[PDB]
C-alpha cells in the first residue's frame, strides 16, 4: 500500500529495442551509489555487422535519470573460416535476462546460435556473459560437444537465470534433448578462472546438470524459469524451475538439490494449457524463515457466475513446512485475458511489519492493455489474498502491447529510506519505472466516553446561555504515533468526532455537543513520534425527551482521524503513509437509561 | 582437476575380444566426445575414432571399422571399448583421451595394455 | 588420409637449451595440428592446441608454430623434466593422423 505512484522514475530506450524486457537492481560491493540494470535485447550494437544484437544498460539513480550501455562484448561474429561465421549474434536478444549478485552483472543472450566446428550448421546454443569489475567471461554451457536436438545444440542457455546466495549460477534452457529442457549450476570462480576464448566447449569442473530422459519427457521445457531457495533445510539454496509443457500441458515445477541436482519435490498443474511454471518465486512470505513457492499459469480459466469459462490466469502459494511437505493455496486473476501472474517479483518487505510480500503482474491488463501489478502483503497465516495495492501502466502503443509488467525486481531499497522499492519493465513501450516505497506510519487511537449508560431525566449540566438543563457525559479522544525509517518527529493530524453517527439522513442526531450544540466536532492536532498517547477532552449532552421518541437504539460516537502527508515530507520528496491495517476509524456506543 | 581412468591390462587367446572401460571425473561426461587411440610397442600413435557419450554417435578410422566397438554408460561417466576378433597385431597401449575441441585432445587416460597370446 | 612426418626421430639437447621439433603434412591442415609430450612411462600430456594456443597448466617454455603444411614446437629453457617424446597431431579432417615422434634425450 505505500508504493509511491505520484511520481515514479521513468527511464527509456530505444524505440523497438523492447527496454524493460528485463530488469535488476545493481549494488557495488563497495557501498557505492546503485544503479537499475535494464535489458533491451532488440537494441542495435555498435558490434560490426550485427543487427539488433541486444544490450544491457545501467541506469543512474536520479542523479540524472540517465542510461549508458554497459560494454559486456564489443565484437561482431567470430570466423571459423573466410566467408564461415563461426558464430551468429545478430538478433541474438542479449538481454533477455539479467541478474546482478554484488558487483557481478549475469546477462544472456539465449537467441545467440552458433556453427559447430565440424559441420555449418546454426544451432542455438545460447551464450551468457558475465562481467565482475574489469573482468568478463563468456559463459555458454550449452555451447558443447552434445549437438543437434538430441544434445544441447537448441538448448537456448539463459533463457533463464539466477544466483545462489553462495554464489552458484542457476541457469535454464528449454531446448535441451528434444525440448526437454536442462537446468545447469555453475561456481562463478569455475566460470571465470577456467575462462579460455581458444577453448569454445570449457571443461567447469563441479558442475550440476539435469539428465537426459526417456522420449516421453519431450517437450516439457524444463528451465523455462528459475528462482532458488533452500527447501532441505542444509543452508544451501536449491533449485527451482518451471516445466509448462510437462504432464501433457498440465504443467509442472521441478525442485532439484541445489548440492547434487538430485530431484526434491514436484508440483503439477491442474488445467490444460494453462501455462503452470510460466514464472515461479521463492520468498518466506510468513516470517517462519521457510522459502516458500509462488507458481504463474497466466493462461488459467475460471468458471463465472454464468457457468462460463474464463482466462484470468491463477497463482499458487505453497508455503513450505518444517515435516517438508507445502501448504498450497490459490489466487485468481481478476481481469479477463490479463494473464495474472505472468511475473511474480518477491519484494521483501515493503510496508515493513515482519512478513515479506510480493506483487504479481497482469501486463495485458487495464485500459487499453496498459498493464497491471498488483501488490500482496504477507502475514503469518500465509499471503493476504486481497491486493492492498494496484499499480496501472500509463503508457500505449501501437505495435505490441505496452506488456507493463512482464518483468519486475523489488527487494532493494534505492534511495536508502528504510524500504524496498519496486522496479517494472513496460518493454512494448520501451519503459521501465522505479516506484520508491513511502514510510508507514501505524496509530495507535483511543476514544473513552464516560458515563457510558445515560439517564435524561439527569441534568446537573448548565447549557452556554441560561439554559442550564440538560443531561451530560463527556467524549476523550486520543492519538499516538510512530513509524520506522526516515521520518520526521512531528505530525499534523486531523481529527473529527460524529455524535449518533447510527442515525442517517433524515434521522433525528439525539447527542450533541455542548459548545457547539451540533453533533460534529472537527480538531487538528500535532503528534511527534514515539510520543505518549496525547489526549483531549469535551463534554455533549442530550436532546429533550420531546424531540426523540428513540431511546432503544444506542447513540455511538465515531472517532475519524486522517492525515496531511504533504506536511511530513522528506529530502527524497517521499511523503509517509498511515498503516492501512490499521483502521482510521473507531467508535464507542452510549445507551439510553430506560424507566 | 580432470582425469580419466582406464581399467587393467587384458589378456586374451587369439580370436577372441576385449572389452577396456575408461572412467571420466572432473568434467561433464556427457557434453564431450571420447577418442580412443593405439599405441604398439615402441611404436606410434593411431587413432582409432571417438563417441558422442550422450547419444553413442560414433565415427571410426576405416581401419577399424569392424575391429572396435566403442559404447558409453552416462550414469557411471564411463567409456567403453571392445576389441573383436583379436590377433598379434592388436596387442597394444590403448588410450582414452577426452575433446579439447579445436582438433585437439586435452586429456588422456594411463592406458590399458592388451596382449593377444596362446 | 594425411600423413603426418617429423624427419628427426631423436634429438639431443642440453639444459637450458632451446629445442624446435619440425612437423610437416601431407596436405594444408589449417592450423590444425597439436602437439603432445609422451614420458617414459606412458603418461601423455597435451601441450600445444591449433598450432598455437597453449593447453591450461603448461608452462611458458612451450611455444607452437606454423600453417599449410610446415609447423614446430619450441621448447626454450629445457628442463630435466622436459626429456620425453613428442608427437604433433592434425585434426583438420578425420581421421586423426599423427607424427612419428621426436623423441628429446639429455645430452653427456
Known amino acids: 500500500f505505500n508504493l509511491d505512484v505520484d511520481s515514479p522514475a521513468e527511464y527509456s530506450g530505444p524505440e523497438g529495442s523492447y527496454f524493460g524486457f528485463a530488469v535488476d537492481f545493481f549494488v557495488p560491493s563497495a557501498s557505492s551509489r546503485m544503479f537499475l540494470l535494464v535489458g533491451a535485447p532488440k537494441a542495435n550494437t555498435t558490434q560490426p555487422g550485427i543487427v539488433e544484437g541486444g544490450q544491457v544498460l545501467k541506469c543512474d539513480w536520479s542523479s540524472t535519470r540517465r542510461c549508458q550501455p554497459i560494454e559486456f562484448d564489443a565484437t561482431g561474429n567470430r570466423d571459423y573460416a573466410k566467408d564461415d561465421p563461426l558464430e551468429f549474434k545478430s538478433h541474438q536478444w542479449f538481454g533477455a535476462s539479467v541478474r546482478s549478485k554484488q558487483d557481478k552483472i549475469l546477462a544472456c543472450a539465449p537467441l545467440y546460435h552458433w556453427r559447430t566446428e565440424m559441420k555449418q550448421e546454426r544451432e542455438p546454443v545460447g551464450t551468457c556473459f558475465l562481467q565482475d569489475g574489469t573482468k568478463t567471461v563468456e559463459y555458454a554451457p550449452c555451447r558443447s560437444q552434445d549437438i543437434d536436438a538430441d544434445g544441447q545444440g537448441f538448448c537456448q542457455g539463459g533463457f533463464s537465470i539466477d544466483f545462489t546466495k553462495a554464489d552458484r549460477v542457476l541457469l535454464g534452457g528449454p531446448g535441451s534433448f528434444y525440448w526437454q529442457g536442462q537446468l545447469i549450476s555453475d561456481q562463478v570462480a569455475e566460470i571465470v578462472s577456467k575462462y579460455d576464448p581458444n577453448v569454445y566447449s570449457i571443461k567447469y569442473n563441479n558442475q550440476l546438470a539435469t539428465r537426459t530422459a526417456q522420449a516421453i519427457f519431450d517437450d516439457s521445457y524444463l528451465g523455462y524459469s528459475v528462482a532458488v531457495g533452500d527447501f532441505n533445510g542444509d543452508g544451501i539454496d536449491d533449485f527451482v524451475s518451471g516445466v509448462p509443457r510437462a504432464a501433457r500441458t498440465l504443467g509442472m515445477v521441478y525442485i532439484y538439490d541445489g548440492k547434487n541436482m538430485s530431484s526434491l519435490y514436484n508440483f503439477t498443474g491442474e488445467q490444460m494449457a494453462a501455462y503452470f511454471g510460466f514464472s515461479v518465486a521463492a520468498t518466506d512470505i510468513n516470517g517462519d524463515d521457510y522459502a516458500d513457492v509462488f507458481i504463474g499459469a497466466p493462461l488459467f480459466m475460471d468458471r463465472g457466475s454464468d457457468g462460463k469459462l474464463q482466462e484470468v490466469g491463477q497463482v499458487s502459494v505453497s508455503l513450505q513446512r518444517a515435516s517438508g511437505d507445502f501448504q498450497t493455496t490459490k489466487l485468481n486473476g481478476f481481469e479477463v485475458f490479463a494473464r495474472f501472474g505472468s511475473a511474480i517479483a518477491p519484494l521483501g518487505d515493503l510496508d515493513q511489519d515482519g512478513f515479506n510480500d510480493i506483487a504479481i503482474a497482469a501486463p495485458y491488463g487495464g485500459e487499453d492493455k496498459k498493464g497491471i501489478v498488483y501488490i500482496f502483503n504477507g502475514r503469518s497465516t500465509g499471503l493476504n489474498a486481497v491486493p492492498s495495492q494496484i499499480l496501472e501502466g500509463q503508457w500505449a502503443a501501437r505495435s505490441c502491447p505496452p506488456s507493463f509488467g512482464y518483468s519486475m525486481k523489488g527487494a532493494t531499497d534505492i534511495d536508502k529510506n528504510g524500504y524496498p522499492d519496486l522496479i517494472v519493465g513496460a518493454f512494448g513501450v520501451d519503459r521501465a519505472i522505479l516506484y520508491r516505497a513511502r514510510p508507514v506510519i501505524t496509530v495507535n487511537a483511543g476514544l473513552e466516553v464516560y458515563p457510558s449508560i445515560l439517564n435524561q431525566d439527569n441534568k446537573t449540566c448548565s447549557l452556554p446561555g441560561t439554559a442550564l438543563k440538560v443531561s451530560c457525559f463527556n467524549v476523550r479522544f486520543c492519538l499516538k504515533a510512530d513509524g520506522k525509517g526516515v521520518l520526521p518527529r512531528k505530525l499534523n493530524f486531523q481529527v473529527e468526532l460524529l455524535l449518533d453517527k447510527l442515525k442517517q439522513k433524515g434521522a433525528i442526531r439525539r447527542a450533541l455537543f455542548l459548545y457547539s450544540r451540533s453533533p460534529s466536532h472537527s480538531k487538528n492536532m500535532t503528534i511527534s513520534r514515539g510520543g505518549l498517547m496525547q489526549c483531549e477532552e469535551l463534554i455533549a449532552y442530550l436532546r429533550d425527551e420531546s424531540e426523540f421518541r428513540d431511546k432503544l437504539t444506542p447513540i455511538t460516537i465515531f472517532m475519524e482521524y486522517r492525515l496531511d502527508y504533504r506536511t511530513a515530507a522528506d529530502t527524497t520528496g517521499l511523503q509517509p503513509i498511515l498503516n492501512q491495517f490499521t483502521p482510521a476509524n473507531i467508535s464507542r456506543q452510549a445507551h439510553i437509561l430506560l424507566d | 582437476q580432470v582425469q580419466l581412468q582406464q581399467s587393467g591390462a587384458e589378456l586374451a587367446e587369439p580370436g577372441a575380444s576385449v572389452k577396456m572401460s575408461c572412467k571420466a571425473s572432473?568434467?561433464?561426461?556427457?557434453?564431450?566426445?571420447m577418442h580412443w587411440v593405439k599405441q604398439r610397442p615402441g611404436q606410434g600413435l593411431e587413432w582409432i575414432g571417438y563417441?558422442?557419450?550422450?547419444?553413442?554417435?560414433?565415427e571410426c578410422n576405416e581401419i577399424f571399422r569392424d575391429k572396435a566397438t566403442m559404447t558409453a554408460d552416462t550414469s557411471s561417466s564411463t567409456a567403453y571399448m571392445q576389441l573383436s576378433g583379436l590377433t598379434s597385431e592388436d596387442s597394444a597401449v590403448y588410450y582414452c583421451?577426452?575433446?579439447?575441441?579445436?582438433?585437439?585432445?586435452?586429456?588422456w587416460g594411463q592406458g590399458t595394455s592388451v596382449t593377444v597370446s596362446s | 588420409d594425411i600423413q603426418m612426418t617429423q624427419t628427426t626421430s631423436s634429438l639431443s639437447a642440453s639444459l637450458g637449451d632451446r629445442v624446435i621439433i619440425s612437423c610437416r603434412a601431407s596436405?594444408?591442415?589449417?592450423?590444425?595440428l597439436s602437439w603432445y609430450q609422451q614420458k617414459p612411462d606412458g603418461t601423455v600430456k597435451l601441450l600445444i592446441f591449433?598450432?598455437?594456443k597453449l593447453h591450461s597448466g603448461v608452462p611458458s617454455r612451450f611455444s607452437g608454430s606454423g600453417s599449410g603444411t610446415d609447423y614446430s614446437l619450441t621448447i626454450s629453457n629445457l628442463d630435466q623434466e622436459d626429456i620425453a617424446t613428442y608427437f604433433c597431431?592434425?585434426?583438420?579432417?578425420?581421421?586423426?593422423?599423427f607424427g612419428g615422434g621426436t623423441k628429446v634425450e639429455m645430452r653427456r
Open positions: 572432473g568434467y561433464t561426461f556427457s557434453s564431450f566426445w
Open positions: 563417441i558422442n557419450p550422450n547419444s553413442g554417435y560414433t
Open positions: 597431431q592434425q585434426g583438420n579432417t578425420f581421421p586423426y593422423t
Open positions: 596436405q594444408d591442415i589449417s592450423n590444425y
Open positions: 583421451a577426452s575433446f579439447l575441441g579445436r582438433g585437439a585432445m586435452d586429456y
Open positions: 591449433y598450432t598455437s
